[PDB]
Specification:
The structure is cut from a larger assembly and holds chains A (214 residues), B (45 residues), C (263 residues) and D (432 residues). With 263 residues, chain C is of the alpha+beta class. Helix content of chain C is 16%, strand content 19%. The chains are: A alpha+beta (214), B mainly alpha (45), C alpha+beta (263), D alpha/beta (432). Chains in contact: A-B, A-C, A-D, B-D, C-D. The structure holds flavin mononucleotide (FMN), iron/sulfur cluster (3 copies), FE2/S2 (inorganic) cluster (FES) (2 copies) and potassium ion. Chain B: It comes from Sus scrofa.
C-alpha cells in the first residue's frame, strides 16, 4: 500500500473543497515570520502539517492550496508530502493507533500488543475500523523504546504497556474519553522499574564549585 | 518544602490541544527580531 | 596565476581552483563513468559511479562534486576504485528489468556500455526485482519507469533548463519513483531533450518508438530549418529513410539541445 | 592520577538534575537548580573563552559522532562574510534505543535553551534552529512554553541577559524520518525540501541552511554546555577518561529487569551498568546472549566482550563496534538474534531516503536476502555474499546511514555465523 501516485477521485480531486480558517492563516503568518525572507518555501513543512491539524487526511487540493499560499511549485509540495512520514494522503479514522515494532520495542513481545489491538478491533494491519474510528498500522522507533512496547494515538504517547493495558485505552477512545498520556506501570518518565538507581538526592545548588571570575 | 523524589509534575502536557504548538507560537511571535534579508523575495526571482 | 598542480595517476596537470575532480581527469583524457552529472546541468552526486580513490585517502570520493586540492594524485585505475565501481554498478543493475531486447536504448544504453567496461559478468541477485507502474507524460516521450535509475537528470533538466518544475520524485527507499504524481501534461518546448538526457530507456521518443536499432542508422550532420536559430543537428537515416533528428553539440547555437518542434 | 575505575557518578554531579521529571521543568525549578546562572558573564567572556573551555572539557560528539566539539565549534570563529550565521540542534532520536534527548527535552528544556544561547554566542550565530522530531509533540510544546517564559524574563532574545548578543530560538517540527537526524539531511529538511543529505564539501560549516554558515549539534551536546561553562572544563575533564571524558546519558533497554535511562560517568564497563541500574538482564548475567551498544548502527557485541569493555568510543572501536548514543539494548538467550537483526535492518530499509544508489538499493537487497536467511532458505555461500554486500554499502553512501545499516550485518555475521549455519541446515532438513 501507501501508493505514491495520486489519482482523480470524487473525494480526492483538484476540485475537493479545502481552505484555511482565519486563525489558520494567522498561524501560517506566524510560521512564515519565523524564517528569513527570500527563503520562504522552507516553511512548507508546518503549514502543510497545519492543514493536517485542521483536516487530518490531506487532499490533493490541500497540497495545491499550500503551494499557492507559499508561492512554491505544486510538485515541490507533493515531494515533501509523499517523502516524509505521517502526512496521511488517504482518509483515516479520527484516532490513529501507531505501535512501534522495531527491535528494542519488539523484544518485550510487542507482537502480543499488536495481536491484542487486532482482536480488540477485529481489523488487521492497515485498514481502518468500519465505524471510521481507529487505524491499525505500525511505526518505527519513534523514540520511546526505553519503555515497554508502547503506542501513540494522534499526539498522545502511552508507555510501559502490556497486552492487557492496551484494552482499557482502546475502549476508552472507543467510548470517547481520552486516556492519560504516560507510562501505564509506574515509571513516570524513564526511571528503573525497581526504583530510583540515581537522581535520588536534592539537586545541585546555584554556585556549585564555579571558578567565580570565570 | 519536602522534595518528593517520586512524583511527576510534567502533567500540563496531558491537556494540550491539537493546535497548542501554533497557539503559543503565535504569541511568541511578538518576542522576536527582524529576519535577515536575502534580497530577492524568492529564489525563483 | 592561481593554477594549482594536481596529479592524475602519475602525470600532473594545471587545474583552476574550484574545478571538480572529474574535470581534472578529463583534462588528461581518462573519463570517470557517470550517470548523475551532466556537463551543462547541476551536480547531484547521486549515481555514485563517480567514486574514485584519492591517493593516501581512506575512503573513495565522488569525482562529480569534489573540489580538487593541492597535489592529490587521482588514482583512476586503483583496485579500490575498480571495486567501488563494481559494487555501485551491481547495486544499480539489480532491479533493472530484463528489457534490453525490447528497450529502445539497446546498444546505446550507457548503462550497458559501463557494464561492458567497468562491471561484473555475472549476477548474484537471488531475489525478485522491483517493478514500477508507468506514468504517461505525453505522446512525445515513451515512459517505462521500471527501467529508471533515479539519476535525477530529468528533474534537474525540468527545473533549470526548461524551467517547468513539474518533473520530480515521490516516496522514499527503493520504492522512490520519479515522475509527476498527478497525471500532469509535460508540454514544454524543450521536453523532447529529456529523451537524450535519460541514460536508460526509461524515457524514449514515442514517434520513433522501436523503428530502428541505433547501431544501423547512419548519421549525417545538418542544420535545423524549422527556426531561424539554425540549431546544429544530426539526421539518423537507415536504408534511405529518415528516422530521427538528434542535437549536435555547438556551444554557440544550441548547446546540445533542440526544440520538440525541431526534433 | 588515572581513575582506576569508573561508575557510580555522584548524584550532585549528574548534569540532568530533572532527568526523571522530579523538579519543576519551567523557569522557577530551572533557576532553583542553577540554570541561567552567570550567563551575562559567559557572553561577556567571549566566543574565544567559550571555545577554550569546550576544548578543555573535551566533549566528543554526544550525538553519536565522536568528533571533538572544540574544532567543530572553532569552525565558526572566522569573520562573518555577511551571511547570517546560525546554530542548529538535532533532536531526531529515531535511532533504535535513543530516548535520552526526548527525556531531557521534556524535563530539562531550560538547560537546552541555555546551551543554545551560550553555544551560539561562541558560534557567532544569529539564532538557533532547534529542530524537534514531529512525533514528540508535547515535548516540543513544553520546550516552547519554557522558551516563551525565558523570552518574557528577557534571558533569550534582544540583548540576551543584558549582553547585546541578539540570539534567538526557533522551534522546528519535522514530519518524521530517521534520515532527518543526519546533519545535512537536517539542513535539507529544515529548508523545506526533502530530507536528503547533501554531499560535503560544501561542509555544513561554510554552507548550511539557506546557504548561511551553520553548525549542527545534539540536544545533549549543547545541553551539557552551559553547566560545564559555568563550572569550567575541569568538571567534565575529571569524569570519564582521556578523549572520552565527562558524562553521557546512558539508555538501557531490551531484556533487562528495569529498562531505564540513567546518567552516569563516562567510560564505565557494561557489567556494572546493566546490573546495578537495570536490575540485571532478565534471567541473570548468564541469560545475556548479546548487547548492542549505543545506537543500532553500532554492531552487536557478544557477552564475551561486554563484561570487560568499558563504554568509551575507543574501547568499543577495539570491541569491533562503536559507542554511538549509549543506547545499550540487551538480548537474552531466548531472543532470536537473526530475527532481531531482521527487524532492525527492516527499519533501516524503511528509513532510507533513497538518494544515493548504495543505500537505496543495497539496503532493500539486504532486507530480502537476510529475511530469507531468517526463514532459513539459503546456501552456506550466501553468508560471504552478504558480507561483501555489507562492505560495498560501507563508504560509498552520501550519508552515514549506509554505514549504520551495513555494520549490524557485519556484527551479526562475525559473531553468529554458526547460528546461521545451523538455522539453514535445519531449514534444509525440514523440507525434502
Ligand atoms: C542516518 C543518521 C541519523 C542520525 N541521527 C541523529 C540523531 O537522531 N541525533 C543526533 O544528534 N545525531 C544524529 N546523527 C548524526 C549527525 O549527522 C551529526 O553528526 C550529529 O548530530 C552531531 O552531534 P554532535 O554535535 O553532538 O557531535 C545521524 C547521522 C546519520 C547518518
Ligand atoms: S535501458 Fe534498461 S532495458 Fe534498455 S538497454 Fe539499457 S539496461 Fe537494457
Ligand atoms: S526517468 Fe530517466 S532521467 Fe529521470 S531519473 Fe530516471 S533514469 Fe534519470
Ligand atoms: S545512505 Fe545515501 S540513499 Fe541512504 S539515506 Fe543516506 S544519502 Fe540517502
Ligand atoms: S523501539 Fe519502539 S520506539 Fe525505539
Ligand atoms: S557523478 Fe558521482 S554520482 Fe553522479
Ligand atoms: K534515453
Amino acid at each position: 500500500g501507501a501508493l505514491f501516485v495520486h489519482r482523480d477521485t470524487p473525494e480526492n480531486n483538484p476540485d475537493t473543497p479545502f481552505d484555511f480558517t482565519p486563525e489558520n492563516y494567522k498561524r501560517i503568518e506566524a510560521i512564515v515570520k519565523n524564517y528569513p525572507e527570500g527563503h520562504k518555501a522552507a516553511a512548507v513543512l508546518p503549514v502543510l502539517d497545519l492543514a493536517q491539524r485542521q483536516n487530518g487526511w490531506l487532499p490533493i487540493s490541500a497540497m495545491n492550496k499550500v503551494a499557492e499560499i507559499l508561492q512554491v511549485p505544486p510538485m515541490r509540495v507533493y515531494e515533501v508530502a509523499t517523502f516524509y512520514t505521517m502526512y496521511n494522503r488517504k482518509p483515516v479514522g479520527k484516532y490513529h493507533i501507531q505501535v512501534c515494532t522495531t527491535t528494542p520495542c519488539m523484544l518485550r513481545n510487542s507482537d502480543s500488543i499488536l495481536e491484542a489491538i487486532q482482536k480488540k478491533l477485529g481489523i488487521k494491519v492497515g485498514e481502518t475500523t468500519p465505524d471510521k474510528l481507529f487505524t491499525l498500522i505500525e511505526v518505527e522507533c519513534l523514540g520511546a523504546c526505553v519503555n515497554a512496547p508502547m503506542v501513540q494515538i494522534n499526539d498522545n504517547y502511552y508507555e510501559d504497556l502490556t497486552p492487557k493495558d492496551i484494552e482499557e485505552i482502546i475502549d476508552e477512545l472507543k467510548a470517547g474519553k481520552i486516556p492519560k498520556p504516560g507510562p501505564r506501570s509506574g515509571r513516570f518518565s524513564c526511571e528503573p522499574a525497581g526504583g530510583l538507581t540515581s537522581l535520588t538526592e536534592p539537586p545541585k545548588g546555584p554556585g556549585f564549585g564555579v571558578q567565580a571570575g570565570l | 518544602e519536602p522534595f518528593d523524589n517520586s512524583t511527576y509534575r510534567n502533567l500540563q502536557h496531558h491537556e494540550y490541544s491539537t493546535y497548542t504548538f501554533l497557539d503559543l507560537n503565535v504569541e511568541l511571535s511578538k518576542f522576536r527580531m527582524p529576519q535577515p534579508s536575502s534580497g530577492r523575495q524568492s529564489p525563483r526571482h | 596565476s592561481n593554477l594549482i598542480e594536481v596529479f592524475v595517476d602519475g602525470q600532473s596537470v594545471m587545474v583552476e581552483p574550484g574545478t571538480t575532480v572529474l574535470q581534472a581527469c578529463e583534462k588528461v583524457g581518462m573519463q570517470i563513468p557517470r550517470f548523475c552529472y551532466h556537463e551543462r546541468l547541476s551536480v547531484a552526486g547521486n549515481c555514485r559511479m563517480c567514486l574514485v580513490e584519492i591517493e593516501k585517502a581512506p575512503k573513495v570520493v565522488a569525482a562529480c562534486a569534489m573540489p580538487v586540492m593541492k597535489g592529490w594524485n587521482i588514482l583512476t585505475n586503483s583496485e579500490k576504485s575498480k571495486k567501488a565501481r563494481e559494487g555501485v554498478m551491481e547495486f544499480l543493475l539489480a532491479n533493472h528489468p530484463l528489457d534490453c531486447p525490447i528497450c529502445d536504448q539497446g546498444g546505446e544504453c550507457d548503462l550497458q556500455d559501463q557494464s561492458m567496461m567497468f562491471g561484473s559478468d555475472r549476477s548474484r541477485f537471488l531475489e525478485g526485482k522491483r517493478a514500477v507502474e508507468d506514468k504517461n507524460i505525453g505522446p512525445l516521450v515513451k515512459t517505462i519507469m521500471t527501467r529508471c535509475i533515479q539519476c535525477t537528470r530529468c528533474i534537474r533538466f525540468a527545473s533549470e533548463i526548461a524551467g517547468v518544475d513539474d518533473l520530480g520524485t515521490t516516496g522514499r527507499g527503493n520504492d522512490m519513483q520519479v515522475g509527476t504524481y498527478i497525471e500532469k501534461m509535460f508540454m514544454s518546448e524543450l521536453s523532447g531533450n529529456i529523451i537524450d538526457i535519460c541514460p536508460v530507456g526509461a524515457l524514449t521518443s514515442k514517434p520513433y518508438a522501436f523503428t530502428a536499432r541505433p547501431w544501423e542508422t547512419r548519421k549525417t550532420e545538418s542544420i535545423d530549418v524549422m527556426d531561424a536559430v539554425g540549431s546544429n543537428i544530426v539526421v539518423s537515416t537507415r536504408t534511405g529513410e529518415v528516422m530521427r533528428i538528434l542535437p549536435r553539440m555547438h556551444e554557440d547555437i544550441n548547446e546540445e539541445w533542440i526544440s520538440d518542434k525541431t526534433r | 592520577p588515572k581513575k582506576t575505575s569508573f561508575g557510580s557518578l555522584k548524584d550532585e554531579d549528574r548534569i540532568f538534575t530533572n532527568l526523571y521529571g522530579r523538579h519543576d521543568w519551567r523557569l522557577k525549578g530551572a533557576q532553583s537548580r542553577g540554570d541561567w546562572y552567570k550567563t551575562k558573564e559567559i557572553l561577556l567572556k567571549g566566543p574565544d573563552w567559550i571555545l577554550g573551555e569546550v576544548k578543555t572539557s573535551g566533549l566528543r560528539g554526544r550525538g553519536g559522532a565522536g568528533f571533538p566539539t572544540g574544532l567543530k565549534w572553532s569552525f565558526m570563529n572566522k569573520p562573518s562574510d555577511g551571511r547570517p550565521k546560525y546554530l542548529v540542534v538535532n533532536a531526531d532520536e529515531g535511532e533504535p534505543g535513543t530516548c535520552k534527548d526526548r527525556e531531557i527535552i521534556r524535563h530539562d528544556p531550560h538547560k537546552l535553551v541555555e546551551g543554545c544561547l551560550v553555544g551560539g554566542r561562541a558560534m557567532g550565530a544569529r539564532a538557533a534552529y532547534i529542530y524537534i522530531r514531529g512525533e514528540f509533540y508535547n515535548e516540543a510544546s513544553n520546550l516552547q512554553v519554557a522558551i516563551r517564559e525565558a523570552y518574557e524574563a528577557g534571558l533569550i532574545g534582544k540583548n540576551a541577559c543584558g549582553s547585546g548578543y541578539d540570539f534567538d530560538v526557533f522551534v522546528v517540527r519535522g514530519a518524521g524520518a530517521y534520515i532527518c537526524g543526519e546533519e545535512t539531511a537536517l539542513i535539507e529538511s529544515i529548508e523545506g525540501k526533502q530530507g536528503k543529505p547533501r554531499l560535503k564539501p560544501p561542509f555544513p560549516a561554510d554552507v548550511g541552511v539557506f546557504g548561511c554558515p551553520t553548525t549542527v549539534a545534539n540536544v545533549e551536546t549543547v545541553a551539557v554546555s552551559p553547566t560545564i561553562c559555568r563550572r569550567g572544563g575541569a568538571w567534565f575533564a575529571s569524569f570519564g577518561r582521556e578523549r572520552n571524558s565527562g558524562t553521557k546519558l546512558f539508555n538501557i533497554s531490551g531484556h533487562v529487569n528495569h529498562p531505564c535511562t540513567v546518567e552516569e560517568e563516562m567510560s564505565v564497563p557494561l557489567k556494572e551498568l546493566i546490573e546495578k541500574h537495570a536490575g540485571g538482564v532478565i534471567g541473570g548475567w548468564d541469560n545475556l546472549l548479546a548487547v548492542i551498544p549505543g545506537g543500532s548502527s553500532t554492531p552487536l557485541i557478544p557477552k564475551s566482550v561486554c563484561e570487560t569493555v568499558l563504554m568509551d568510543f575507543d574501547a568499543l572501536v577495539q570491541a569491533q563496534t562503536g559507542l554511538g548514543t549509549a543506547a545499550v539494548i540487551v538480548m537474552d538467550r531466548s531472543t532470536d538474534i537473526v530475527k532481531a537483526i531482521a527487524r532492525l535492518i527492516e527499519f533501516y530499509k524503511h528509513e532510507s531516503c533513497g538518494q544515493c544508489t548504495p543505500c537505496r538499493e543495497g539496503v532493500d537487497w539486504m532486507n530480502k536476502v537476510m529475511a530469507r536467511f531468517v526463514k532459513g532458505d539459503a546456501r552456506p555461500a550466501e553468508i560471504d555474499s552478504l558480507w561483501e554486500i555489507s562492505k560495498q554499502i560501507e563508504g560509498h553512501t552520501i550519508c552515514a546511514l549506509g554505514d549504520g545499516a551495513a555494520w549490524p550485518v557485519q556484527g551479526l555475521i562475525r559473531h553468529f555465523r554458526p547460528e546461521l549455519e545451523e538455522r539453514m541446515q535445519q531449514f534444509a532438513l525440514q523440507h525434502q
